[PDB]
Amino acid sequence: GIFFPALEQNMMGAVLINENDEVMFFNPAAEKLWGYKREEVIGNNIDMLIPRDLRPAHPEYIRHNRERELQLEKKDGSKIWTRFALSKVSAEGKVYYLALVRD
């Protein structure tokens, strides 16, 4: 029972997307980085977390992989630089991705 608390209480932002690119987990550190409360994010397509100017390209990148210093755009349109760590998580016969993000 300690795996969920270890991610929930992580000092890094944690974002898990499912096989249809919907956000399934979004922790309080991620709420602070993006300016969204998790209730606004869960169950929605990852697109809402992607900077507006990368929404054309980003789906092709995920699709290609299914087959880093990054600039994050907040809810209010302001931007911050982050470090992203991505892991591909194979479970339940599905491919999930976990992003671990820090300022």
What proportions of the chain, in percent to the nearest 5, are helix, strand and coil? 30, 35, 30
Residues near 44 by beta carbon (within 8 Å), at least 6 away in sequence: 22, 23
The yes or no reply on residue 12 touching a second copy (CB under 8 A) is: yes
- Please choose, out of 39-47, 49-57, 66-74, 80-88, the segment that lies near a second copy by the rule CB under 8 A: 80-88
Residues found near a second copy in the complex (CB under 8 A): 1-7, 9-12, 14, 16, 24-25, 85-92, 96, 98, 100, 102
Residues found near ligand HEM in the complex (CB under 6 A): 15, 17, 46, 49-51, 54, 58, 61-62, 65, 68, 70, 72, 86, 97, 99
